[PDB]
Structures are given as C-alpha cells and as structure tokens.
RNA sequence: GUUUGACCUCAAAUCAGGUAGGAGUACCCGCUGAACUUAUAUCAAUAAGCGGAGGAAAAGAAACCAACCGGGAUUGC
RNA sequence: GUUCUUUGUAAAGUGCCUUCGAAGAGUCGAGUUGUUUGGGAAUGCAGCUCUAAGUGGGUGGUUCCAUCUAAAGCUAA
RNA sequence: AUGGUGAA
C-alpha cells in the first residue's frame, strides 16, 4: 500500500538558492549540418584539452543514416559529474 | 561555518551515511552551524543507527554459527522510507514536477545499465519498471512535443501541466561503464528519484483517473517488452499531439523501434513490427540503404520525417524522407 | 603453496570417480541407442524436464523439430573436477569461464552432448524478449594483432565484421539468433558469447546470508539425477 | 610452576579431531527462543482449529552435565578450557576418569557457548544420538580417547 | 585466513531508567570513651564524640533450659 | 449479596504398598596477646602461628545416659 | 576530663 496517497493535495529563504538546471542542447545532433563537423586540427584540439574545463562534451559528426548512429558510453561520467555538482555547490 | 569533520563529528554518524543524508536533504557547504544542527533531528539518523545495530547483531550470529537466528533477523528488519523527507523538500506538487528533469535522467539512465556487482539488478528492474510507468503515461496524454536526437541519446520535452520537463534517454547500445563514476554516490539519488517518481505517477494517475501501478501485458512482455506491454486501465491540446491520427507504420529491423513506438503511440498512430514475430499499414519506416520489397500500398519513409514532424508539428511532405536518399539536416528545437 | 589435507583429497577423488562412471554409463547407453539397439535398455525415447515455480514438474519428450537453447554456467559439482570427456565439451563450447553462457541449436547429436554436460549447466528455452535483452545489455567484438575485447558499441562495426550476410545492425544479430536463420551458427560463434555477472556479487553481513539463502535455493530449484536416462532439466531462463 | 591438576587443561584435542567433534555438535543445536517459540505457536494453531519421538539436544548445563556424569548416561563429555573459577572444572576430569566417561578438554568457552546458542558454556555433553550418528559418535568416542588418554597419558603427571 | 567474528576485561556518553549525602535525635543498634566522686575494685561498658533506621528498634522460632511424671520463639512485669 | 469468568488429561490434602533419601570450613577447636563481668570453667568479644569428621559435632550430668543440630535469612503482637 | 573558639 506504499504510494497510495497524495502528499501535496521552498528557496525563498535569503540564504537558500535553488539548484540551477542545466542549459539545453549545444547542437549535438547526430545528423547535423556539415558547419558543426569540426574540422580535423580543431577537433585534435579539444580532445587534447582538459575534461571538465571544455567548450563541449562531444564532437558533433555528420552521420549517414539513423541505423548507424553509435552508443554513448560518456552519458554515465556527466550523469555522475551531474549528480557530483548537485550536492557540492556551494550556493 | 563548521568543517565537515566537525560536522560528521557532531552528527557522529558514517562519512558515507553523512554524506546519503547530506544529499537526502539537499545540504550544501564548511556546512552551516544551524542546518546541521537542525539535520540532527531527522529520523533518517535513527533509522541509520538501527541499520548499524542490526549489522552488528547479525554479524554476531552469523559467527556464531546459527543461520536461524540471522534469517530471522534479517525477515524482521524494515527499510526506512523518504515519503515524509520528499514534502519538506518539495512543499508543492509544481516543485516537484519542475526538479523531476534530474530524477528522470537518472532513471533512465540506469534503467538501460547492464547489471553489475556495484547495483543489484532488483534497482535495475525496478527503474525500469519507473521508466515504463512514465512513457505508458505521456504517451497516453500525448504530451511529448520536442524530439533531438543527439550523440548523447534523444532529448524528450514532457509538457506535464505544462511545466515542458526536458529528460534525456541513451540508446539501447551496451555502455562500457567506467571505474571514474562511484555508484555509491549516484545509488542514493537512484532511490531518492525512485521514490519520488513514485509518489509523482501515483498523484499524475489520481489525477488523470487511472489505476496505480497497472499491471503489464504477459503476452507482449514475452515478445515486445517495453512501453508497449505495459497496459494502464482507467479504472488535442497542440497539432503534435493529433499528427498520424489513425495511422499504421512498420518499423524495420534496422530502426529503433523502442524510441519510434512511443512516438508514434503518443501522436496517436499504430505500430506494426516484424520482429514481433520471432498488412494494412500507410507508412513503412526502413533504414535499408537498398529496398527489395518496393510495394505500392506502403509509402517508405525514415526517422527523420517523424521526428521533424514532432518537432515542428507539420505533417511535412514526404519529398525529402525517402528511403536511400539524404536527410535534411537535423536542427536543435531550441 | 598451501598445505593440502586429505579430506578434500579423498572427497575430490570420490566425487570424480562417480562422475566418470556416470559420464560412461551415459555415453554407452547413448552410443547403443544410437546403433538402434534398444532391445534391452531402461528407455528409449529421450525426455526434457521442466522445472518452474509451488514448483511444478513437467516431462515431455524431445522430438527432431529444432530449437533455440541458451545455457549459462553453473560451477558444480563442488568437489567434482571436471572430466576429459566434459572438458572436451566445455572447450568447444568455450564455456569454462564460469556464469559464462551462449546460444546453441537444440538437434538430436547435441542431446546426448547437454545430458553430459546437464549437471555442469542450466539449460533452457528463453523468449524472445530475454534474448532482445541479453543481445542488447552485454556483447564484445573483436578488434585489430587484435588483442581488444571492446564492447559492441556501434552498428558499422557489424557491417565491417560480417557483411556478407546483411548483418548491419545488432538487430540483424537479434533476428538471426532467435529465428532458425541461415547465418546462426557464423554469427554466434562471433559473437563472443555474454560473460553475465554473479548472483549476489557481493560479501559481508547481509551479503553472506543472501548468499547462503541463494545456496539453499539452488538445492532445491536444480538437482542432479545421475541417472542413465536422466531426462535434460530446464528452468525459466527468462527470469534471469 | 603448577601442581599436576593445573596444566592438565590446555592439552585440547588437535585441529581435526576438534572440527570433526564440533561437526558432530552441530547437527543437535538446541532450539534457540524463536525456534521453540515457533513452534509451540505453530502446535497451539493446529490445536485451536484440531506423537513426536524424544527430541534430542546436546546437555551442557554444569549442574545438569555433573548430575548426568555419576550415572553413566553420557557419553561425551566436553570441558571448557578457560574457566575463570577453575575450581568449578578441576573435578570434573578425574570425575569423568573415575566414572569411565570418555571426556575431552576443548579450547575456549565461547565455542562451546556457540554451538548451545548461549555466550559461554562451561561444558558440554551427550547423552542419547539418533541411530544414524551411532557409529559416528563411536568413532569420534573412539578417536578422542586415542588422542587424549594414550597421546596425553601423562597429562596428569609433570607438574 | 598477513583474516573476520566471538568470549573475557578495561574506559567514554550533558544516553534512558534509578538511589546516598543533610536535618532531627527522648527510645534503639554498633565503634569509641575519661575525671571529680569511694575504701585491681568504683564513679563506669557512664558523660561527650562517631556511624545507621524506624514509630517503635534489637532479638526471635534452640548446636535452648533442665536431671524432673521433663518444659518447647523472642519479648516486658 | 449482585454477578462476568471458569479450563486443563491443571493443582492440592489424607491412608496404605514399593524404590530412593542429599544439612552451611580459615568454620568448631586448640594456642597466644588485649578487652568485658562482682560472673569461681575470662564464658562472651578483639589481632594472629595452626586448623578436623560425618552412625559426626556441640551442650551436661555420670560408667552410661539426657537434649540439640552451629558456621544463612524473614517475621505483626 | 570530654567537645569547640582565638591568638606577638
């Protein structure tokens, strides 16, 4: 009988603050336009930069069909950066 | 403030029980004197300090040598609950439908995690019972209304009492797991969002007049297994919602048909799937690159033009979604 | 290295001893029933257990239709070493790995193959759901030397694997795996069979007495009939 | 130095002999309070709504094992080699070997307490097995006063 | 197993449930305790001091009294 | 008095027949050094070398008999 | 004598 009953039917403190969301999407389309495609050096240049101090979390690629879009196996790093950052923010 | 070692000290509690009642209640740093303190008095720490008993009593007896007594031990035992921590939280129903977006990402998330050491696959089951739940309702109420598909997974915007909740959903591919992420600190918000997606689909089924939890269809759970299989039992607003109205699709082999099912039961189409079996449709959605079959009572379209559709909620001629020919570029609906 | 007691020496030498006159008697029964000698043996016609939950035993026997079969590991006999005979087997099958498990085609040469090996593995005859599931959650491809394991992550590596065969997508894989397909046996054998984890995976208070209760149930749920005719047991995989 | 009762004890049984002794133990383990609880419960249901043989239990009480001993009803007798009142436990070897019991010397009460489900017992003893375990109660009877009478033959010598 | 848990012991909690202090003191129950006063004896197992409860306190149902036809807890006259 | 409950092969008492049948140790006592009494058998109390048996031991009178069972405790008059 | 008080 757990979940079987309404509890409706908070930041407005001045030392409270609510927790921000994340912005949308950055263009990270599987299939967008060939603009996005980074070119070969810049593209060396972000995955040679440092994680967690970069533009983008991806690299947007010009694929040709939906069936051949690939997995993510990053997803669960900034679920747990997500997930890192909601509890250590110091507001 | 008081460091956080002064602060575990004062609790005299676990680093790792600090740190579930920590994010339990949301506490953020170096902590402040006052909210510790006032932390001090939840019940969370008396059910910990009962744990903790319990822990030691049965390592006793399973020493000793006397099964029994651990199995009856461990028989007794009750969990604590969060029902009472989520309305301090979130006073209001709205708050709480506003902060669903991460709850419904970490869902999600696990619910496609393969089973591992770190989380049992009970968790797994159980997210993936949640996520169901979900789909099942939004595509009864028909409010998704932004599809992008992305590198990262498909962008889904639920417009639940017109909040426009944005989750993302990874593909069904296997993911390596990394040692980087600790589970520890992601499992306590996996049961913190699994409750209050609980409590959030008991109130949105009170609300729409269905039964809570509805049970799931046995036939379709051995063939079909998903959002579909999952039957809800009782007991318009935008054009996306009323696109493929009484429309048939078949969705090849190639194509997801987990993320185009609950697409196109939300618009309000059928869908027909040949892998269901390991005639009257009006689309035929293929990835082939090259197509053999080539009837003239199915008109072959791609992914593309549903999602298109969704996003902009046109109905767009089938001129540029043919199959074996380029798709238009795919745009962020934002 | 550790000294080694008798006990466990005499215990391993016994047990090893039953399962080589077991795996004898077996195969010689089968050899004669294969030269359609059944005038004087126990039974004739081969019989399949089903074991589900309370639990309810069904016996129907095996006709030549063939089937999917999937069979997982188990680890067992405790103190059984495992023979030459059922070594063979194992290798073929690449299954010595322990939780490890593939799909076979069930035909009347490989009945005599699983009754050897029943005790070693749990068989049985999962949905086509529980396959969809298992072929989407784990799997691994081999890549360039090619000493990499990685996981299965994109559909364009099928097409480079195989191609011929129009497996492009890890659903072509899905269909011909669970359908009597053409390319069943190419594309298993590639396929790098799932390595599935452990039941409890885990060790302490709790974890120890989970562990004993799900000892206690193995018992009970999966036995070991070492009779000449022992009929092949199978359980819901799908609950796994 | 000690007299020749003292240092008698802590001459305990080797490690095989006492793992299979307490093997043999633990196939009596008295019911604990739940268990016995359960079941007088489960008896009282059957009775509201409408024969078992002699049940069989290890004897360990000090009083209860010394009445046993005297009358020659038990026949294993276990001794607690850590006693804090070591008088209670002085007597009790020569009483055994006076009584022709067969006894052994085990180390530690704790372990005795353990396979009896209480925190320490001072001894513990058998008085009646099920006929399976009759040739191995036997054997082990047999087993201990080979490694303690003949292998300890001057344990009561030496000082 | 270079490892876990038990038995035993020793300490901490502004933890939970509990109690002793002191006053009063005529009577009681124990320790201690002198001199005047009178020819070891005697004031005197008293005065004072110390510790402990009550409305009374101690004692109390014989390792008793008796040598009789035997009596039968202690207590006070 | 009025009643509501009784509970279960539960408990207790008497006569007869059979089989068993357990009692307090640095304790008594002796020795020695102080205290107590008007007490001749310092009994009683106090330090300490020593320290026993269970058809036994203590208390007494006569060559045997008489009484009790100490080294644990409660009890209103 | 007992019990206490003060103090170039």
């Known amino acids: 009988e757990n979940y079987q009953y309404d509890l409706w039917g908070n930041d407005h403190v001045m030392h409270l603050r609510a927790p921000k969301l994340p912005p949308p999407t950055n263009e990270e389309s599987y299939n967008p336009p060939e603009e996005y495609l980074l070119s070969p050096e810049e593209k060396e240049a972000w995955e040679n930069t440092e994680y967690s101090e970069r533009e983008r979390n991806f690299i947007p690629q010009k694929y040709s069909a939906l069936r051949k879009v690939p997995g993510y196996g990053e997803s669960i790093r900034e679920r747990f950066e997500r997930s890192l950052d909601l509890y250590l923010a110091p507001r | 403030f008081i460091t956080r070692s002064q602060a575990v000290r004062k609790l005299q509690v676990s680093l790792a029980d600090f740190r579930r009642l920590c994010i339990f209640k949301g506490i953020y740093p170096f902590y402040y004197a006052k909210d510790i303190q006032y932390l001090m008095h939840e019940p969370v720490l008396a059910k910990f300090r009962e744990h903790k008993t319990f822990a030691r009593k049965l390592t006793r007896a399973l020493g000793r040598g006397e099964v029994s007594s651990a199995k009856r031990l461990e028989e007794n035992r009750d969990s604590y609950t969060l029902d009472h921590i989520i309305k301090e939280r979130y006073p209001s129903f709205p708050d709480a439908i506003r902060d669903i977006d991460d709850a419904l990402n970490m869902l999600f998330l696990f619910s496609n995690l393969p089973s591992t050491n770190q989380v049992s696959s009970k968790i797994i089951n159980d997210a993936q019972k949640i996520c169901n739940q979900w789909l099942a309702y939004v595509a009864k109420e028909r409010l998704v209304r932004k599809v992008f598909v992305s590198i990262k997974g498909v962008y889904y915007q639920a417009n639940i009492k017109g909040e426009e909740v944005r989750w993302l959903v990874p593909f069904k591919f296997p993911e390596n797991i990394p040692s980087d992420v600790d589970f520890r600190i992601m499992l306590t918000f996996l049961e913190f969002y699994s409750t209050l997606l609980h409590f959030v689909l008991y109130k949105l089924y009170t609300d729409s007049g269905l039964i809570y939890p509805p049970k799931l269809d046995l036939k379709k759970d051995k063939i079909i297994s998903g959002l579909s299989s999952y039957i809800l039992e009782s007991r318009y607003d935008s054009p996306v919602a009323s696109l493929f109205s009484a429309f048939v699709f078949y969705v090849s082999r190639e194509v997801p048909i987990d993320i185009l099912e609950f697409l196109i039961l939300s618009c309000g189409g059928n869908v027909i799937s040949e892998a269901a079996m390991d005639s009257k449709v009006t689309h035929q959605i293929v990835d082939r690159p090259v197509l053999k079959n080539k009837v003239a009572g199915r008109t072959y379209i791609q992914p593309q033009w549903i999602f298109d559709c969704i996003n902009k909620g046109e109905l767009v001629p089938a001129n540029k979604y043919l199959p074996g020919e380029a798709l238009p570029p795919h745009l962020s609906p934002w | 290295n550790k000294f080694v007691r008798a006990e466990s020496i005499v215990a391993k030498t016994l047990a090893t001893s039953r399962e080589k006159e077991r795996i004898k008697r077996v195969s010689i029964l089968e050899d004669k029933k294969a030269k359609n000698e059944t005038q004087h043996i126990a039974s004739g016609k081969d019989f399949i257990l089903k074991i589900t939950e309370g639990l309810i035993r069904e016996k129907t026997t095996y006709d030549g239709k063939p089937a999917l079969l999937f069979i997982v590991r188990v680890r067992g006999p405790l103190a059984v070493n495992i023979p030459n005979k059922a070594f063979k087997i194992l290798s073929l099958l690449r299954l010595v790995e322990t939780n490890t498990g593939v799909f076979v085609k069930l035909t009347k040469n490989v009945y005599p193959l699983l009754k050897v090996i029943a005790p070693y593995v749990v068989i049985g005859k999962p949905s086509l759901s529980s396959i969809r599931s298992l072929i989407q959650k784990r799997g691994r491809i081999i890549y360039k030397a090619e000493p990499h394991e990685i996981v299965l992550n994109d559909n364009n590596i099928v097409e480079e694997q195989l191609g011929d065969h129009g497996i492009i997508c890890v659903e072509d894989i899905i269909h011909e795996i669970a359908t009597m397909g053409e390319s069943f046996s190419v594309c298993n054998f590639f396929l790098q069979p799932f390595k599935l984890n452990r039941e409890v995976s885990g060790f302490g208070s709790l974890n120890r007495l989970r562990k004993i209760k799900q000892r206690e149930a193995e018992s009970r749920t999966r036995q070991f009939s070492n009779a000449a005719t022992a009929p092949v047991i199978e359980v819901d995989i799908d609950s796994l | ?159």
């Not at chain 4, 490690?15 to 008896?43: C, D, G, I, S």
């Not at chain 4, 009480?61 to 009358?71: F, K």
């Not at chain 4, 002085?90 to 704790?110: D, E, Q, R, S, T």
């Not at chain 4, 006929?131 to 201990?144: F, G, H, N, Q």
Request: aromatic content about 8%; hydrophobic content about 45%.
């Open chain 4, 1 to 159: 130095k000690v007299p020749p009762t003292i240092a008698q004890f802590q001459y305990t049984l080797d490690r095989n002999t006492a793992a299979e002794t307490f093997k043999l133990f633990n196939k009596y383990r008295p019911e604990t309070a739940a268990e016995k609880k359960e079941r007088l419960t489960k008896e009282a249901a059957a009775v509201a709504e409408g024969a078992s043989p002699k049940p069989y239990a290890v004897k360990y009480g000090l009083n209860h094992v010394v009445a046993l001993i005297e009358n020659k009803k038990a026949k294993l007798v276990l001794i607690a080699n850590d006693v804090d009142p070591i008088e209670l436990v002085v007597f009790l070897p020569a009483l055994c070997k006076k009584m022709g019991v067969p006894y052994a010397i085990v180390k530690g009460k704790a372990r005795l307490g353990t396979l009896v489900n209480q925190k320490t017992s001072a001894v513990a003893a058998l008085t009646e097995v099920r006929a399976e375990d009759e040739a191995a109660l036997a054997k082990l009877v047999s087993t201990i006063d080979a490694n303690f009478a003949d292998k300890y033959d001057e344990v009561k010598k030496h000082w």
